[PDB]
Amino acid sequence: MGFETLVVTSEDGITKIMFNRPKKKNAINTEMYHEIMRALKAASKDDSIITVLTGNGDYYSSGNDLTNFTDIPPGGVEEKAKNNAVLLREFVGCFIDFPKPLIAVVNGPAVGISVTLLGLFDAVYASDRATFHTPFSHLGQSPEGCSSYTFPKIMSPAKATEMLIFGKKLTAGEACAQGLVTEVFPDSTFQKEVWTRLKAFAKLPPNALRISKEVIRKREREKLHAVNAEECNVLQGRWLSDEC
Amino acid sequence: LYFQSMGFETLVVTSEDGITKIMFNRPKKKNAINTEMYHEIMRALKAASKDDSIITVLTGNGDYYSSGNDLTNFTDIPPGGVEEKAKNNAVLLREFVGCFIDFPKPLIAVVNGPAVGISVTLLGLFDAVYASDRATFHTPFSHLGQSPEGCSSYTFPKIMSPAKATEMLIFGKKLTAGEACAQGLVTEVFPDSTFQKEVWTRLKAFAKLPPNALRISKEVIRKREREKLHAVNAEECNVLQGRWLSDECT
Amino acid sequence: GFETLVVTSEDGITKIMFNRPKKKNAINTEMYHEIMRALKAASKDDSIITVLTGNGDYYSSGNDLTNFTDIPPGGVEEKAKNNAVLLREFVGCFIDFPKPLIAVVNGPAVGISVTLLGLFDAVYASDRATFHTPFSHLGQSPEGCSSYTFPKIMSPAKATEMLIFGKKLTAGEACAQGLVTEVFPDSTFQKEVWTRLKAFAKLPPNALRISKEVIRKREREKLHAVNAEECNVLQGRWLSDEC
Ligand SMILES: [Cl-]
Ligand SMILES: [Cl-]
Ligand SMILES: [Cl-]
Known part of the structure; x- marks a missing residue:
């Protein structure tokens, strides 16, 4: 351990996974996947x-x-599409499958896949200067990260559409209101408060946490995986199109 | 097929800026939906x-x-009496709701004032809902001895939480625009004076997005869910047919 | 003729009152x-x-x-299996109840009495009611269908702070998060709720029952399956070191 694009640390029974490409606003490249x-x-x-x-x-x-x-491979755009689709599908699936409580500490602006995945987390804490933007249809693409299923369930199809289809950018307050974020904190004390709270959580009975989440999450996985898959076929097609 | 605008008796249907605008047009009768309008x-x-x-x-x-x-x-009673009136109204309603379940483009409601009954329940099928602050929402079904329709027996609990949906479908609480926005039914409320302006500016923008992307994105959200909605619609209609032949309706 | 409840019926409203105020209305085997x-x-x-x-x-x-x-002849093995059967059957009654069901939350609620709220048709709370499900704190898993209903009602984001991390909600929070239908100031709570309920009771009776039926029926089979699953996982949790 061992990472080029991340910083993975483990303290207090809390594994922290930190995106680490601040120069490129933590953009997720093939390696980071x-x-x-x-x-x-x-x-x-x-x-x-x-x-x-x-x-x-x-x-x-x-x-x-x-x-x-x-970066273009030997089989042309045909194969790059198919390869990216396979990788994405697998990538999302790790989140669908993750067995321990998973938490997102949103420290600042979030975009695209990083946002859509948020529907798979167990809690999402954000700083009041975080924002949430999924401008898919602007770039000729379809939704992914299961968001086509999770976001209507979480926000109401009414609010989900303004975001997945019309690309409205949400403020942290809006996102919290619309169910996407668990709580917002003022920027100055953001880091302190979250970590205090997380530290407490990590002191709860460990199998109880793991089993409780299991009960909430399991029955729902098969569906999510099928949504993932469908989303990925449609996305593969969207990449070979004139509008992309 | 039609060129810029279509000939209707109860509606005004225009097409401008890649937006098709369908207006209820019986303002004398508070835009009540009659058999022809269906x-x-x-x-x-x-x-x-x-x-x-x-x-x-x-x-x-x-x-x-x-x-x-x-x-x-x-x-308006047919030769087969109330028996057949009910069966006919049930067939029409089912087919009517079905159109909304199947509509393939992004569908948006501009709620310019008070909405009631079927006009409200259908909102659960729309893609966005923009309301003026003097819009209200009311579905007093049980008050007139009827059961829910428009797929609202399925969509409203999902959208609002069963706790809040029941106060509306079962106990006929009327919502203000703000309440409806808060409860997930309305996408956004606007002050009345600038309502029309604001909504249309935003809509014109939306219309400028990559056309196939919008159509495909909706498709991905909406498709896997239609089969269930058609089932709900069907079931809601039988239960409604029954309710119309009952003592509590008269 | 009830030992732990007070059941009355007036105005077409049946009122069921938990009646063990000395023990903060704790639900014991008999009350189930x-x-x-x-x-x-x-x-x-x-x-x-x-x-x-x-x-x-x-x-x-x-x-x-x-x-x-209270320990039976078959030891903790059988106590668990019996409690699981009772709980499963108990939750089932709420899943199946055919008339409109309303919770008047007069003060603090905990555990199973909170999780069941996801099955009710309306929930009116006094501003001094609170809602707390500290399951994982006592080494247990969710029940009352709450592993299914609470994410649907509150969003998984907010449901998790409650079922997994045991955050206690105030009535205002609970109402905001979709769990409670409306909050009333304590002084006029009783008055306001009953006025409203008396009105509701005057609505066309078959319409109420039929409307609820249309909302609720298609959804029961799933809830029963959730209830069952929740109970097996709970049975296991009772025979564990963390409990
Ligand atoms: Cl990729
Ligand atoms: Cl009709
Ligand atoms: Cl028990």
Whole structure:
């Protein structure tokens, strides 16, 4: 351990996974996908009670890196699409499957896939200078991260559409109101308050946390995986299109 | 098919800026939906579904969004009596709701004033709902001895939480625009004086987005769910047929 | 004829009142049985509307701690299996109740008495009511269908702070998060709720019952399956080191 694009630390029964490309506003590139997956696969097995994701610097994440498309393979755009789809599908699935309580500490602006995944977390704490933006249809794409299913359930289809289809950008307050964020904190004391709270959580009976989440999450996974898959076919097609 | 605007008796249907605008137009009768308007609304959507607008809006003329079903749809009695009137109204309603379940473009309600009954329950099928601060929402079904429809027995609990949906479908609490926005039914409320302006500016923008992206995105959200909604619709209609032949309705 | 409840019927409203105010209305083995018999009764009688409420200062403190300590001939193995069967059957009554069901939350609520709220048709609370499900704190898993209903009602984000991390909600929070229908100031709480309920009871009776039926029926089979699953996982949690 061992990471180029992340900083993975483990203290107090809390594994903290920190995006670490602050220069590029924590954009998620092909390597970071793989690293995130390995970090979660690792934290799912270790003996931490609780797993956090957060961003280094001013951004939570700007979502997918624009350079994941431009690197072109031997089978042309046909194969790059199919390869990205496979990777994405697998990537989302790790979140669907993660067995321990998973928490997002949103430290600043979030975009794209980093936002859509938030529907799979167990809690989401945000600073009052975080924002949430999924401008999919602006860039000719469809939703992913299961968001086509989770976001209507969480926000109401009325509010979900303004965001997935019309690309409205939410403030932390709005996102909290619309169910996406668990709580907002003023920026100055953001880091302190979350961590105090997380530390307490990590002191709760460990199998109880793991089993409780199991009961809430299990019955629902098969559906999510099927949504993931469907989302990915539609996304593969969207990438080979004139509008993208 | 049609060129810029379509000939209807109870509606005004126009197409401008990749937006198809369907307006209820019986402002004298608070835009009450009568048998003819049902048919026209279906033909209007069928049209908007096939033309080359990006976005479809539903709105009311005058002060009301709609008062819901027209009371005069019951009194016009056929040769088979109330038995057949009920069966016919149940068939029409089922088919009518179905159009909304199946509509493939983004569908938006511009609620310019008080909405009632079917005009409210159908809101659970829309993609956005923008309301003026003097819009209200009211579904007093059980008060007139009836059961819910528009898929609202499924969508309203999902959207509002069963706790809040019941005060509305079962106990006929009327909501203000702000309440309805808070409870998930309305996307956004606007002050009346600037309501029309604001909504249309925003809509014009939306219409400028990549057309196939909007259509495909909606499809991904909406498709896996239709089969269930059609089932709910069907079930709501049988239960409603029954309710119309009962003592509590008269 | 009830030991732990007070069941009355007036104005087409059946009122079921928890009545162990000395013990903060804790639900013991007997009260489970009585609540079931009371509902089974109210389901068949000619009331339009059924209310649950608490005597005294508490709505309910949830399960009584003395339901575990009374030990049977088959040891902890059988106690667990019996409690699981009872609980499953008990929750089922709420899943199945056919008339409109309303909780008048007069004060603090805990545990099973909170989780069941996801099954009610309305929930009116006094501004001094609170809602707390500290399951994982006592090494247990959720029940009352709450592992399914609470994410649907509150959003998984907010449901988790409650079922997994045991955050205690105030009535205002609970109302905001979708759990409670409306909050009333304590001084006029009783008055206001009953006025409203008396009105509701004057609505066309079959319309109420049929409307509820249309909202609720398609959804029961799932809830029963959730209830069952929740109970097996709970049985296991009782035979564990963390409990
Ligand atoms: Cl990718
Ligand atoms: Cl009709
Ligand atoms: Cl028990």
